[PDB]
Design a protein around this ligand. Sequence first.
Ligand SMILES: CCCCCCCCCCCCCCCCCC(=O)OC[C@H](CO[C@@H]1O[C@H](CO[C@H]2O[C@H](CO)[C@H](O)[C@H](O)[C@H]2O)[C@H](O)[C@H](O)[C@H]1O)OC(=O)CCCCCCCCCCCCCCCCC
Ligand code: CLA
Ligand code: CLA
Ligand code: CLA
Ligand code: CLA
Ligand code: CLA
Ligand code: CLA
Ligand code: CLA
Ligand SMILES: C=Cc1c(C)c2cc3nc(c4c5[nH]c(cc6nc(cc1[nH]2)C(C)=C6CC)c(C)c5C(=O)[C@@H]4C(=O)OC)[C@@H](CCC(=O)OC/C=C(\C)CCC[C@@H](C)CCC[C@@H](C)CCCC(C)C)[C@H]3C
Ligand SMILES: CC1=C(\C=C/C(C)=C\C=C/C(C)=C/C=C/C=C(C)/C=C/C=C(C)/C=C/C2=C(C)CCCC2(C)C)C(C)(C)CCC1
Ligand SMILES: [Fe+2]
Lengths: 30, 35, 137, 447, 340, 335, 82
Amino acid sequence: METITYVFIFACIIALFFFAIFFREPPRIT
Amino acid sequence: VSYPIFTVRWVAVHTLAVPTIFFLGAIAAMQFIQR
Amino acid sequence: AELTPEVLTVPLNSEGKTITLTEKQYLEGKRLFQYACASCHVGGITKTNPSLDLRTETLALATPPRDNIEGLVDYMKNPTTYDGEQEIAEVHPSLRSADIFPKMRNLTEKDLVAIAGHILVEPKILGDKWGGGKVYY
Amino acid sequence: DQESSGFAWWAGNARLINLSGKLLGAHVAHAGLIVFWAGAMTLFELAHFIPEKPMYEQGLILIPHIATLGWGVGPGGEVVDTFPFFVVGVVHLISSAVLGFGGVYHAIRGPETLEEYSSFFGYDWKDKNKMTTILGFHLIVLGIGALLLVAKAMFFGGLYDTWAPGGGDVRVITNPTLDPRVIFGYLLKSPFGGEGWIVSVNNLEDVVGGHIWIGLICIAGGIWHILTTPFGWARRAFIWSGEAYLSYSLGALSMMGFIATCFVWFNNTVYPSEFYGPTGPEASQAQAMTFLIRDQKLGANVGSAQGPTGLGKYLMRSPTGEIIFGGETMRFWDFRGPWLEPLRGPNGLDLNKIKNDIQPWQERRAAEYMTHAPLGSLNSVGGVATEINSVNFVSPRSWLATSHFVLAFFFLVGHLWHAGRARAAAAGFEKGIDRESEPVLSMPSLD
Amino acid sequence: GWFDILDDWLKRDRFVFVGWSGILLFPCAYLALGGWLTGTTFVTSWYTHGLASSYLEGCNFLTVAVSTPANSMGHSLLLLWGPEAQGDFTRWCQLGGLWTFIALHGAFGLIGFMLRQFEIARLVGVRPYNAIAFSAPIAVFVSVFLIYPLGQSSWFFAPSFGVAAIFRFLLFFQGFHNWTLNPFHMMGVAGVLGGALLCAIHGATVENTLFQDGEGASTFRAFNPTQAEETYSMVTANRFWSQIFGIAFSNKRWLHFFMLFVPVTGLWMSAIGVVGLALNLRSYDFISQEIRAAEDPEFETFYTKNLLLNEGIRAWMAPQDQPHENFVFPEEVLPRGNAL
Amino acid sequence: SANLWERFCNWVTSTDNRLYVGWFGVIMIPTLLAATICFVIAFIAAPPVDIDGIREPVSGSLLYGNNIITGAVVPSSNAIGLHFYPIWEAASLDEWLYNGGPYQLIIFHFLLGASCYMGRQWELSYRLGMRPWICVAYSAPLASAFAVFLIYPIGQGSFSDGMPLGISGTFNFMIVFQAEHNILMHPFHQLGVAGVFGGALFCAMHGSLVTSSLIRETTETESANYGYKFGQEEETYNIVAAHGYFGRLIFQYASFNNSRSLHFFLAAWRVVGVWFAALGISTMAFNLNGFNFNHSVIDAKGNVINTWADIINRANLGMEVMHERNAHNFPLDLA
Amino acid sequence: GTTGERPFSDIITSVRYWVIHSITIPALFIAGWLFVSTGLAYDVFGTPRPDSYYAQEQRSIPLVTDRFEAKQQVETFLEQLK
Ligand SMILES: CCCCCCCCCCCCCCCCCC(=O)OC[C@H](CO[C@@H]1O[C@H](CO[C@H]2O[C@H](CO)[C@H](O)[C@H](O)[C@H]2O)[C@H](O)[C@H](O)[C@H]1O)OC(=O)CCCCCCCCCCCCCCCCC
Ligand code: CLA
Ligand code: CLA
Ligand code: CLA
Ligand code: CLA
Ligand code: CLA
Ligand code: CLA
Ligand code: CLA
Ligand SMILES: C=Cc1c(C)c2cc3nc(c4c5[nH]c(cc6nc(cc1[nH]2)C(C)=C6CC)c(C)c5C(=O)[C@@H]4C(=O)OC)[C@@H](CCC(=O)OC/C=C(\C)CCC[C@@H](C)CCC[C@@H](C)CCCC(C)C)[C@H]3C
Ligand SMILES: CC1=C(\C=C/C(C)=C\C=C/C(C)=C/C=C/C=C(C)/C=C/C=C(C)/C=C/C2=C(C)CCCC2(C)C)C(C)(C)CCC1
Ligand SMILES: [Fe+2]
């Protein structure tokens, strides 16, 4: 049980890596 | 020009330079206190 | 002042006579003890065989008595187990066996008496720290 | 070359990379401290060396090498000739003057530019051939003594061989190794525990035997490059610049130094221990040996003694070779030295042997190595991390292996910073990034 | 005027600034440096730890330390002229004292110095923020030199003002508080450590994305002290890590700010954590494990395997570390593995 | 096309691929992909490991009873030590499992691909055309990770004693060490804790000042941070009004006007100390442990006066004694 | 920024610096030394000298027991103590 809680965090975080890198707000050269 | 010898700057630089050598001498002295 | 005359005075013969000592001899004792090798023997234990220590009592119970400024001398000259049964000369530094342990060559009755007095003396000051290791350290 | 039209002071030697070096003499300049250092320390070493005291017990880094070459030793690791050692340092030392006497010149009073005096091979880096030919000389140069050693090994006195029949003893390498499978085979050998590609070397027959092969192999290269120009995929591949040359070249040391540090810590052959300390693993194996004896001699069966953990105190079992000492000592069941090999067997350590053919000359060498172990503090108080001050001793191996790593490491840091700055000239952005023509402020935005 | 004269004077430039603050910074801060120094050189610390704490006694740099008050005083400020010492600068120097001194005088040096960061800051038209960041240490030094001790038994168990004497402060925690395993302390290293990288990187990351705007092999001079001109292409930046690490520090106000945060923050998380240790509230615990540690004598995690090290650190040092308890542990009671 | 690889060649070196993948890339990229994959699982669900020379299995998997902190994937056993224990040398998959073979995989792998990242750390500074004394900063890091996973092991002979991959594991690798190396009393680690502490202080310093002399561009409702656009031509801070402050705050000349120098100081400090440190471990790797002053201070009679380091050492024995109880089958922890 | 307090290179490189100082610097170096040599430093800071850390016979530590009548303690220890 609690070890899923560990693995759930561990995972949803790897996906916070997904978005923050690929759907991150881009650098606008102006 | 003519800048004093008793400068704010100096009082400090001194409180240190006086002891330091007082100490350094104290220590170089201990270097032999055998027995 | 602290390393006093009689505290530097120790038993000579299994018969009582005391040789007292000097600050000179004591020193050679230190210089020696370490050069004669504390490599197994460092502090007051015995790394090759931890079961035997150099504490005053231990040397007394030895055979023949080995607490005599004398005793240790025979030993260093010729070694014997705690049995006094078979000569251990080949596995232990000894003048009998110099060709094995070089350090033991430059050794003399002068140098010996010293390294000896060092052994019977150290306990007197260090207390138990002499026999024990690690634990007391 | 003054300041402006040069680098800053800390990058001093860079202004010497300009035009044609004013001094080879720098390199020679120190090519002396290096040889002079042998002259001082060697003198200094013997200057403190006693013949009885175990060579490694008297901080002898330099002296042990002479011994390992057969000089001033003979029977056992005992030193008979205090002379030979003295000789070598005296010579080098003095030898250094000429080396420095000249470098010191070449740098201030000679051609501030040998680019012009050129002629004799001369100077300029981009010059792809002057460089192929130069290294070429220094290639015949090395292999030169590869043989020099083979000679000392085969024609002047021999080397020290701990394995050597009787026991450690100056012996002459009669029959070096032919078979290329062997001499070369090491490179192809495992890198990990059990077989180090360079390190693993039982005897001298393969050493001097291999060196031979290297002298010629190496000479064949100087002879080679000296005659020709590097091919086109070569030019295409590697940046050519004085710096860039140091850049590569420097990272051959880095690697190599590790290869030393990793070697001086592990071998009993080329580093006898009678001159250096007993090798790390040897130690925790020596302990084993000493106590296997202590009890067996005290009346214990040893072989059939069930140990605390479930394994057995004195004897244990390894996965590939069946039998070895057991403790935590296991890690070193790969250790091999003459003091423990007699008591060896087909399947591994032999119970029958270890029980009755274990002689005295071993219990005492075994005990020396149990004590004298590669363990000490900078303080130089040899022993466990927590030992009382008294017996002090730091293994030559400690200092040797340690240093070279930190240096060899640092060098790897070098191979980088000199490649990092040199791969930069290659396009010119090494000075910086041009404020009006930068590749990035004009490129398809990643997104 | 009368005030402003004092102001006017002490307030303007003269190299080594001296301000409304200095009045407490300089004096406290000085004594403090001295306070520690004198001890290491001449003062002994024997009458409190039976331990030598001075060059004069033979101690070295890594040995010397200005003791800490015997467990007999507790938290008494131990005053030079107080009931305990009675202005007897030798006894007062003997009962330790210098400690409370160094620590208290010191405690001000910080208060004082941070103020100075404000004073000079409000005078130069900048954001004090630096002065804020400086809480980072005040909190630490407060908790770790006053709070923790104040929470325990005596000034004794408080830091040591030593080189090694301070290393003891570590182990002792690991061994008794098993700090190493305390969340709060963790962020404490998460910030220091995490920040160091942040520092070493911005520093170098900057150096390399430097516009060659000088001539030759000295990009150190080519920089303009005079005016505005982004020296490091912020553009050659993002498009670098964005492709090498996946992320881009696009902006410099935040970058050069987030660097303020990292540490200061962790430190606080440390100061909190230790506050815990003050009232022995520590993270040694970890029931879930220990409860199952009872049965299953064969299940073993590092936690336990580690926790055991601690248990040794106690049994061996306590007797000599905490002398005022006259601990006595017979040969037998000491925990040891089979062998040594 | 003349050859189809031609495109593979520019792609790898695509100076515009969202995520650059150099030639190092082509090795890094997966070396870590395999390394990570083994890891993430070993943690989530992996059997115990005999680690120490015996047959005492140490569990380190969440599914086997680990809190995230107790978590850790364990090393290879003193049985293998240095021999190469790859997945095929082991008979049953479970052998590799028990004898702790994941370690080598994870360690060897990342510990490798890591370096290539170090290379590909610079490969972008070449395709991008920027000074590259950057990749080096990264060294110190990789050096240590290499030190704590590859030198020390070769030093003591077994991967057994190499900082176990896991949280509480490190703590272990540590406390032990102190005991066998008195690392804390080691001149190197010092210069290590030196910079780290520094950098962590400088990281807050340089970050402090900048934001402290930030400049104008906002209301009070607006976020002051907004005052800036990516690709600004002139820096946002007022350097003169910064040094003009900091310099003053004690000494005036112990300050930096040379932004290039300062940002540099930030680089080298952390990066240099960390090195020494990385070397510290690598130094004691072959037993040149920290200092040692036990019984080094004595009086006349010889009665011994404990040095404040003797306590260090006292607490040290407490450590020496316990660590790895059962295996140690002899008087001297010669490994 | 505009700075104007009496310059350093000036005096470290000054002829007078070295002449006032040459004589006075070691006066401190010497002063410290004497402070140690007389052996007053000891009595100055209670700091015991090797000759007198432990009494002659006893093996115990002269530890301050009660914070309020501490002054006595020290004595009674320094007392019996040589
Ligand atoms: C198989 C695929 C592996 C993939 C790994 C890829 C990773 C990328 C590489 C980076 C680092 C890992 C590479 C490992 C190299 C280290 C050597 C090693 O581990 O192998 C261990 C061996 C040890 O050899 C020993 O050899 C011994 C044999 O000696 C014994 O037996 C002998 C006779 O047989 C003699 O009698 C002797 O006296 C006696 O002691 C035993 O067999 C031991 O078990 C055995 O360990 O070392 C050696 O031979 C090899 C020497 C190589 C030189 C290395 C120099 C030092 C290493 C520095 C690492 C650089 C990286 C740094 C990056 C960070 C910043 C720099
Ligand atoms: C392998 C051999 C080798 C050789 C021949 C060179 C040669 C060179 N290196 Mg170099 N380097 C090497 C290895 C080598 N390096 C390694 C392994 C590293 C990794 C750290 C480096 C890192 C490095 C850097 C960062 C730089 C160089 C630079 C240089 C060039 C400048 C010359 C020089 O620095 O002299 C001058 C010697 C000094 C300045 C030494 C003093 C160093 C100062 C900063 C500290 C002073 C020490 C002080 C604390 C001593 C205490 C004394 C006490 C009494 C006060 C020169 C071509 C410079 C360059 O740009 O060349 C292209 C440069 O910036 N190197
Ligand atoms: C470590 C070895 C080493 C060597 C071989 C050199 C060599 C050189 N450096 Mg140099 N340098 C070094 C370390 C070294 N450096 C370090 C560590 C730093 C950091 C401070 C520098 C910083 C630096 C700068 C800024 C410059 C050089 C320059 C030079 C070159 C000019 C030499 C000269 O003008 O001397 C002049 C000699 C004197 C003024 C008097 C010195 C007397 C020496 C030569 C004799 C000593 C011999 C010994 C004591 C006794 C032997 C006597 C013998 C007859 C038996 C020369 C190639 C210059 C250059 O750019 O070259 C083109 C230059 O501008 N260096
Ligand atoms: C290959 C490099 C090397 C190595 C491995 C050694 C190793 C040794 N030397 Mg040694 N030495 C060297 C070069 C080296 N030396 C050189 C070039 C000189 C001439 C100056 C000397 C002069 C010398 C003397 C007079 C003595 C020794 C002694 C020793 C032994 C004990 C020294 C010790 O314990 O203090 C440890 C020393 C340190 C820990 C120094 C601290 C390092 C600080 C300054 C930072 C270093 C950082 C940097 C990366 C390392 C520099 C490398 C080194 C060449 C300086 C030890 C075997 C002693 C001995 O054994 O007598 C027979 C001894 O009396 N050496
Ligand atoms: C270590 C490598 C090395 C290399 C590659 C060189 C290379 C060179 N040196 Mg040189 N040198 C070196 C080491 C080196 N040196 C050392 C260690 C010293 C210390 C003295 C010198 C001292 C020195 C001086 C005083 C001079 C040179 C000169 C030269 C250049 C002349 C080349 C020539 O035709 O000589 C060919 C030499 C031989 C083939 C050797 C012949 C040996 C016998 C047959 C006669 C030599 C005279 C006698 C034996 C002793 C020499 C006395 C001396 C005045 C030459 C050449 C670039 C000359 C120069 O100015 O170049 C521009 C020059 O005047 N060197
Ligand atoms: C590859 C050639 C090679 C190798 C493997 C060795 C090996 C050895 N020599 Mg040795 N030696 C050599 C060449 C070599 N030597 C040459 C040319 C000379 C001059 C004649 C000597 C002179 C010499 C003396 C006087 C002594 C030794 C000794 C030794 C042994 C001591 C351990 C050691 O440090 O060396 C082995 C370590 C290495 C060889 C380092 C390995 C690095 C190489 C294999 C890789 C280099 C790669 C590099 C990038 C090449 C670039 C080429 C290009 C493709 C870029 C060891 C077996 C000692 C000994 O054993 O007897 C007493 C000793 O006293 N040597
Ligand atoms: C001493 C320093 C030194 C330096 C700096 C050089 C430098 C050079 N040499 Mg060279 N050389 C030297 C010494 C040196 N040599 C010596 C002592 C010899 C004696 C023969 C030679 C003999 C030699 C020859 C015959 C040639 C060179 C060539 C070269 C040039 C190309 C080398 C290259 O880039 O390799 C890069 C090579 C690789 C990166 C190999 C990668 C492929 C691997 C996978 C091989 C496969 C391994 C295989 C399975 C066996 C084992 C594999 C593994 C398990 C170990 C380069 C300028 C070449 C040149 O153009 O002119 C001479 C060339 O043809 N050298
Ligand atoms: C200035 C500091 C310093 C000092 C005092 C030393 C001192 C020493 N080094 Mg050394 N080393 C250093 C820096 C230093 N090193 C650096 C920066 C590197 C690059 C990482 C090395 C790489 C290195 C290796 C690979 C070896 C040494 C060895 C030695 C020892 C024998 C010297 C020697 O080999 O004579 C003349 C040469 C030999 C006796 C053997 C030659 C080995 C063959 C020819 C391969 C190539 C040699 C090597 C690459 C050249 C370096 C020689 C050295 C004098 C710099 C000696 C204690 C040897 C050792 O371990 O003890 C015997 C050894 O094998 N060093
Ligand atoms: C590694 C430990 C450490 C040291 C020793 C240290 C030292 C210093 N930090 C300073 C500053 C800072 N540190 C800062 C954040 C941090 N600093 C950190 C960690 C340290 N900072 C970490 C925790 C954070 C990370 C951000 C901020 C940004 C600043 C400041 O800007 C400031 C600075 O500008 O530095 C240049 C300097 C301020 C000088 C001063 O106030 O004197 C004046 C008054 C003093 C110090 C008198 C105090 C007297 C008290 C403390 C008595 C103590 C005596 C003992 C502790 C001495 C014992 C010595 C041992 C050997 C036992 C300098 C003293
Ligand atoms: C660093 C440099 C420099 C210089 C120099 C160099 C670098 C080098 C070198 C070198 C050198 C500087 C060398 C040398 C030398 C010489 C010598 C070293 C010598 C000698 C001799 C001796 C030492 C001897 C002695 C003796 C004898 C004769 C015999 C018997 C014994 C006796 C001891 C008596 C400078 C600063 C300017 C800068 C540039 C670079
Ligand atoms: Fe900045």
